[PDB]
Design a protein around this ligand. Structure first.
Ligand SMILES: Nc1ncnc2c1ncn2[C@@H]1O[C@H](COP(=O)(O)OP(=O)(O)OP(=O)(O)O)[C@@H](O)[C@H]1O
Ligand SMILES: Nc1ncnc2c1ncn2[C@@H]1O[C@H](COP(=O)(O)OP(=O)(O)OP(=O)(O)O)[C@@H](O)[C@H]1O
Ligand SMILES: Nc1ncnc2c1ncn2[C@@H]1O[C@H](COP(=O)(O)OP(=O)(O)OP(=O)(O)O)[C@@H](O)[C@H]1O
Ligand SMILES: Nc1ncnc2c1ncn2[C@@H]1O[C@H](COP(=O)(O)OP(=O)(O)OP(=O)(O)O)[C@@H](O)[C@H]1O
Ligand SMILES: Nc1ncnc2c1ncn2[C@@H]1O[C@H](COP(=O)(O)OP(=O)(O)O)[C@@H](O)[C@H]1O
Ligand SMILES: [Mg+2]
Ligand SMILES: [Mg+2]
Ligand SMILES: [Mg+2]
Ligand SMILES: [Mg+2]
Lengths: 568, 23, 401, 265, 540
């Protein structure tokens, strides 16, 4: 009945585009209805707020309500149910009547989908009647009003697709708040850190750059996480007092020490948050978008990738580059989104560079292991693909890595069945929806490009093809040095091993097998070495040049026909 | 009024098949 | 919190959060939150959907109605975080992953469990931690419970002999009958220290929960059952048996703690026999796959079983996966291979060597047709080494006979 | 009718835009953070201090702005007005223009002139060639020089996750296409909707090939609809399509000249 | 559940054989139960009606119910299923109990196949339990009914094979409502047109001949379409009256004119439906099922020798089935047309199909070959599966030498499996026509008598025949006739077949369009258009 005059517009930031639409669609036909009365125009606009969960929908609808000043009727869907089938409609009939009786008025149906789901699956009689009562109540607004003191019903929900189409048709105005951009997140961070003590090194613009895919709720956790880091020094001092009072692992003792006193509360000095604590806070906070379905960042760096300079240049100029400098690349017409289909013989490093790109781009990473999205139920197999891109867009920039993609988009022959074709078509449409300025970088890897659909390789789709093939003799030297370096002979002996004619067809995996064979040959030599020198555990196994000599003899290339993989 | 627990119908699934080739 | 009335169930949850705010500073523990906060998208029921929405409002009332200096923390525990509603999972600012304990953690757990017990001085907890891979904190409790019952084994035989000698059908049925008439006839149990040998016996008796589904029994075959195959035994001992027993030694020279071996050769030469010896002589966990037994008639279930298969081998490392007659599970990817079998080959390609790390899983394959296996599988990283188990020689038949 | 109601609703909001800026200007003059936030704070200040919004009327310039902001419901699913593309946007391809002006453009303009010499309409054209060469561009030029309605619906965009609805969608496609005659249906990347009517098709893709075949028989003579299909692999398309009378005559759109590439670059 | 005395026996026709069985199996154990009572034997008969959809299954069960007069309980299978799993059995248990409580009674389980499906594949618990509930409810009828009165269960379904064999066994009487024949369709048409005013030219036998593959529902639309055409004259007269009363587009005014009067009613003259409107109505109505070709003998030029052979083995034994059957002339299963390609083999088969008024299916060669072991033979069997259902039907196998090659030793196991399937189907009102240009490659078991043992050679025209064909082609599309002689007698048409002459006419037509285009930059088909058409058309 009264506005909630405790949250203001200043407390909600980053919604500048959303607040612009809400000015001419909610505020105006609630306070300046006289102009509409002079104009003679009924306002039947049902304003619907939708977007990712945590974007500040509930808070905004309460901040707007407190600012407009007109009578406000907050409605919570679970609180509508009282304990009787007929009483549920009584609560709804007591809202649309009260708003009409107290027009102009604002109705907020928070979590509308909790009582406005799909009626097709609504088997229960009570559930299907609440939707009918709600939808009829909107027509009464258009009828029982002077066409001047309009009543606007505002509904907020994080699942706009769950609304009954009988209801969503009645909500003409739909406001997609979406996720805030880099400029918007800076505004939120400044707004959030307004009652706190801060240092001078805090660059909120820098903080916004390295928090992609965060929403207003997620940015609140980053501030909250940084506050805890600011109090870390005030806990160690509290721990030290407990240690000095008392003459099991260390963390357990800390709980036991603080459990002891529980009454001798000591003053926490009022320190301020530095910039180093904010960087620590961002790492500790996982955004709500990255909670589910996002793979862990691989441990592979460019130091783990030997040679492949041509592939590295293409990857550092099409994916890693645009992620680091989205403005430098967009000046030369390089859009911050790409689709790359890595292909080549097996064992040559297609997955290795994709794991290095995911790790060297510092961006979000989603990995799909072949036909991981297929499900035995109807529609759920296709919904997984659509939901896959529903989070890749929300967490842009994001890297989608389809490993062994020939199993997910096979050639649409007669022997395909009406289950994977429905997924290939869905995957084709989603790749079309990936905008040039969307921020999704799709990487595909397959070792049999002759079995992958040719429709996936068109522009807009995975139209960029990078060939990863067998290394040359000079190329294997970089790879063999890279492999030996990452496991610890020096580097001059590695050139002799890699340039040997017995490694003519070796791929990247074969060179790794060569090193493992030499390592096993060392241990066999060590086992006999420690039996002649002993009959004390001080034996030193070291990979010697003679171990490489017998490793070259017993290792053959895993690739049979190198030219079999150059045909597509 | 007391809401009782009521069982309902089940979902449908998909089944793969194998087809021979005379060639 | 579930009530029979049409609104009682939601009211109970509203009462929980309102009470906590009234009782601030308060800690709320929602144990098994996935039971009531499942995805309402798939949980197509109005009460279930309105229960989830009431929790969202409750967790927001705490953030606003609590006065300064009196905070309310909402703890929640669930072993299926993927069942949570994303609108609710986002409402937890902190997610803590308590994975399976490591060797250092298991030693600490055993000390905490064996804290109020009369232990012996020969107990080497750092040895017990290394001999129980894949155990969780709940499994280690059963090892201690099994060890305690073993200590009373000598206290039960004495008690049985007391009843058996007090008055003159198999023997175990007699024991129950004697104790059936021995009710309220309490006899003192002299408590004794739990020997270190009882703990080793207790570990064998306790099977960890990760090994209670899909894990095959260890074969009884040993190296005394295998004749000849001296070269094959050396390669298997260096590639699998070696790193399983001494992981530290092989890590020093730079050998990844994972192996892939493809045993191939003419039929009847001992490919399954030596794979059963490795699975038995390595003293590691064993999962045996008998040909194309992972295939399912539903869409995506065949590849789900393969992915779930490695989800068990990885969590119980070191583990040995034996694919007997492997050519039926990884045939060459041709245009005539159909999609049901081609989607399984690619799934096994990503599991053996992909983005994910499978260190601690050792894969053995046996087949009479090595040339019919996909060329991507037969590369270092998936099945790196091929061992030829051919016909015995003249002097090998003597050892075999 | 629904879209024109949105245009009126859009024009009304634009008509009240001037009454908010004037209200904002008064608040600014009273008081010597992003701009939208200030607007809420400025209007929060007065509130009860009601100022009479002047009663203005909608002009024609506001209606023109409203039309641009409003996307008609027909453009949601590929129905579009006559394209703005002329033959001046199409470089070279003189041979293709002559074939199109005698089999498509001609019969659209004079449906009676062609029927006098026993030339039945709806001859059926399958544009094909490498991607990016102007197959959709030339189809937009045909739609504009024919002065007929143009629909650009792609094979994969019409697919829906249900039994029968993919083939039923095609029949509704020609139902509205018929109501707006003359109309040009452009099936882009048609090789994914009609690959080949073999025995191994299942009664889900067969229901779309059979439905599309019947609709192509019904086309042209009765209604003025000329269906155009595009595919880049003229070996993956169904043989039931490329028969005389439905989709016979094949025109290859590709190989741009040097001057056409200059405009694109 | 009272019997509706609405649809009568007169309103259901063509079921004379069906109405004879239903008299001693439904009427007797519902009205004359006393005779069973004296003998003391309950008569429980579950009558099952099955056939193509639209054959008049639902209507028959309601016409019988209204004539018997006993209590009637209509049951629709989908409405039995309720929201709760247990409620579905509740609906069924409230039916078989009601019939027992209200014996004697008639139960109509319309669309029984919607719930009595095969519980084998119906693995869901509810699906497999409806069938069990249905079967138990029928046993209670046999047990708990009195000796005096009987309860008859009538079930209708268009897919009798989908019924659970545990259920189809409970329906002893099965009536397969096939499709009506020419004699039967005449009875249906007369029954439908019984309360209408008709003219004297209406030949119901002619209507039945030219409506093959129609069912009772389809024939109701044909009657409904002709009735609307019969009122077209009554609307123009109605419009003129409104115009004469009142001195915006025309259709809007017509609505406004009729809104004026309303209560003021003027007489509609009682006109009658002619036969020409019935012929127009049939064309406008497309049956749910192929279609008689539009090619007549006026489209076929010359070929008099071929026509006589075709008019004596196929076309004759269709128009007068009794005149030919009087002298022992069985209708040969078909004709094997052979000759060079493009000479009119498909054209004449379409002409035979049109002067025979039967359905036509054309195969353009090896369309039936499949890479699978069974679908290639199933396509041939499905070809004859529809041909029987739409009898009379003409099956035309064009280029049949690729579908039935000679079964020599070098044949493998793919074409032999197709020849055998085709041989058995030809043994099983279907007129199969085959065409091939290499008769030395077709199996000799096909060309035996009873199978396609009649061979008619359709060959290239010499010179006079092309004149008739070119005149025929030009006549059906609108140069005069003197120029057509010059074109056909030109030495450049030496090897032209029938298709080449058709291609020649299209080339001349295209040459006309080129002339119109240049005329409008600075239409009658002229001789100069033929001049450039002769150059650009090859015999191929
Ligand atoms: N732009 C923002 N500026 C400041 N705080 C924000 C912003 N967006 C969100 N928040 C904070 O995050 C929380 C948002 O709660 P709210 O219920 O509005 O989320 P939501 O977007 O509506 O999602 P849901 O509907 O799933 O609850 C509040 O604590 C609010 O302070
Ligand atoms: N340039 C390289 N430098 C060092 N090691 C390399 C290089 N290329 C490949 N390797 C080694 O080979 C392995 C191959 O891993 P990856 O999955 O990328 O193989 P692949 O080339 O993708 O073949 P597949 O098709 O079997 O996946 C790497 O993990 C690494 O051990
Ligand atoms: N080297 C050997 N020493 C002793 N016994 C052997 C040896 N090789 C084979 N055998 C005997 O032959 C049996 C064959 O069992 P196994 O399953 O290994 O056959 P296989 O060699 O794997 O052939 P396949 O894979 O074709 O089944 C063994 O169980 C053992 O009894
Ligand atoms: N033998 C017939 N005599 C008269 N009218 C008939 C006959 N057969 C069908 N009809 C007419 O056609 C329609 C048939 O209705 P009905 O519902 O019985 O069809 P059906 O054969 O049961 O097929 P479906 O199962 O699709 O309903 C009615 O309008 C009926 O008047
Ligand atoms: N006697 C004829 N009169 C008119 N047109 C004919 C005649 N013979 C053949 N044609 C024309 O030749 C074309 C091909 O006919 P036909 O030979 O039956 O089919 P196909 O060439 O496929 O075997 C038809 O379009 C028809 O118009
Ligand atoms: Mg919210
Ligand atoms: Mg790889
Ligand atoms: Mg074996
Ligand atoms: Mg019926």
């Amino acid at each position: 009945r009264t506005p909630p005059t405790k949250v203001s517009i200043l407390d909600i930031a980053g919604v500048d585009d959303t607040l612009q639409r809400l000015l001419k669609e909610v505020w105006f036909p609630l306070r300046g209805g006289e102009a509409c009365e002079k104009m003679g125009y009924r306002y039947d606009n049902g304003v619907l707020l939708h977007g990712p969960s945590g974007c500040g929908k509930t808070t905004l609808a309460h901040a707007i309500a407190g600012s407009i000043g007109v009578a406000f009727i907050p409605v919570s869907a679970p609180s509508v149910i009282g304990g009787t089938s007929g009483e549920s409609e009584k609560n709804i009939r007591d809202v649309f009547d009260e708003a009409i009786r107290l027009a102009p008025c604002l109705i907020f149906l928070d979590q509308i989908d909790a009582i406005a789901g799909r009626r097709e699956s609504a088997n229960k009689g009570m559930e299907s009647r609440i939707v009918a009562e709600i939808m009829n109540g909107m027509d009464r607004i258009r009828q029982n009003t002077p066409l001047g003191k309009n009543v606007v019903v505002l509904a907020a929900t994080n699942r706009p697709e769950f609304l009954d189409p009988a209801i969503r048709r009645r909500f003409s105005v739909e406001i997609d708040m979406g996720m805030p951009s880099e400029r918007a997140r800076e505004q939120i961070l400044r707004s959030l850190t307004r009652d706190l003590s801060l240092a001078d090194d805090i660059n909120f613009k820098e903080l916004a750059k390295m928090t992609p895919g965060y929403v207003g709720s997620d940015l609140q956790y980053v501030v909250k996480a940084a506050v805890s880091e600011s109090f870390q020094a005030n806990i160690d001092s509290l721990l030290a007092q407990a240690r000095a009072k008392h003459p099991v692992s260390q963390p357990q003792r800390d709980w036991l020490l603080l459990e002891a006193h529980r009454d001798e509360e000591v003053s926490w000095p009022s320190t301020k948050i530095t910039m180093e604590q904010f960087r620590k806070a961002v790492s500790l906070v996982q955004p709500a978008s990255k909670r589910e379905g996002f793979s862990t960042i691989p441990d592979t760096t460019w130091s783990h990738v030997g040679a492949l300079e041509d592939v590295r240049k293409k990857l550092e100029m099409s994916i890693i580059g645009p992620i680091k400098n989205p403005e430098l690349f967009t000046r030369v017409g390089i859009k911050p989104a790409a689709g790359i289909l890595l292909w080549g013989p097996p064992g040559c490093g297609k997955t290795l560079v994709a794991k290095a790109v995911a790790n060297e781009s510092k961006a979000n990473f989603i990995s799909i292991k072949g036909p991981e999205l297929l499900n035995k139920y109807v529609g759920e197999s296709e919904r997984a693909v659509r939901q896959l891109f529903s989070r890749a867009k929300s967490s842009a920039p994001c890297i989608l890595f389809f490993d062994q993609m020939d199993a997910l988009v096979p050639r649409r022959d007669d022997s395909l069945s009406d289950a994977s074709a429905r997924v290939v078509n869905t995957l084709l449409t989603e790749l079309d929806g990936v905008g040039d300025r969307s921020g999704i970088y799709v990487i595909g890897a397959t070792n049999r490009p002759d079995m992958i659909d040719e429709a996936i390789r068109r522009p807009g789709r995975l139209g960029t093809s990078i060939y990863v093939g067998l290394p040359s003799a000079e190329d294997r030297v970089k790879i063999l040095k890279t492999l030996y370096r990452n496991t610890v002979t020096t580097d001059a002996d590695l050139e002799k091993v890699a340039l040997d004619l017995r490694c003519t067809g070796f791929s990247g995996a074969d060179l790794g097998n060569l090193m493992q064979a030499a390592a096993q040959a060392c241990l066999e030599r060590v086992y006999t070495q420690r039996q002649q020198k002993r009959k004390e555990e001080e034996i030193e196994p070291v990979i010697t040049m003679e171990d490489w000599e017998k490793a070259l003899n017993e290792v053959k290339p895993s690739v049979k026909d190198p030219e079999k993989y150059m045909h597509s | 009024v007391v809401v009782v627990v009521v069982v309902v119908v089940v979902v449908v699934v998909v089944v793969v098949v194998v087809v021979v080739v005379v060639v």
